């Protein structure tokens, strides 16, 4: 998940 969130939309982001 450290690896996942390095290049996926951040947890708090919507739109």
């Amino acid at each position, epitope marked *: *998940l450290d*690896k996942y*969130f*390095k*290049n996926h*939309t*951040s947890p*708090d*982001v919507d739109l």
Partner: antibody
Amino acid sequence: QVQLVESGAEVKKPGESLKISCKGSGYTFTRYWIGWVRQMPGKGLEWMGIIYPGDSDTRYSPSFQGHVTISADKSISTAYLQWNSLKASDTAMYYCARLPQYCSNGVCQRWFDPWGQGTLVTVSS
Amino acid sequence: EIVLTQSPSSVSASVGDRVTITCRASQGISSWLAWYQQKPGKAPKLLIYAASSLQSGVPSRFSGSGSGTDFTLTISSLQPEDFATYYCQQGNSFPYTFGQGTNLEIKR
């Protein structure tokens, strides 16, 4: 809630080294890019660099590449900005800020939220 | 780098007036423009991200629009507490850049 805490002020002499800190809380520190921005005289902001605390991968602005070092200690959810040898003209307000991102197919776009209070670094004899 | 140019550089307006600030980017940045408010002596605060998304807790009188190279920040009904410097910022391309800043002052 989400907060970045830095020191408000650091004073050093020219030629001295300095490392300032920014401690994140209220979120998972390893899951967000975090970075540093310099306040320019009067108006203006200059992005300096970012680090991903999950693995310490860094990216610098070409203006700041090789002049500063950004690092992170995920144990204590803290990012750092360091100069080896300060000049008087390095004096400035420095901000740390988290960078939320939106990505599709591994390509990410970023903004700055939230920002720490800023650290006024003064370099003077 | 992508250069962002805000217009105008200073604005003075009355409480209740509509204020509009534009940001023109030197190349396309799609919709990846954020707007910040910065009061004197204080850190910037995000107002708008992704060109038009309003940050939570930011009053609805603030709105953003645009895409490509022409973006607009609009304050629909200026309040005294809106005195600040406003910045745009592109997050599409390294290095990340900010506009030069627009000072907003209140006439009274």
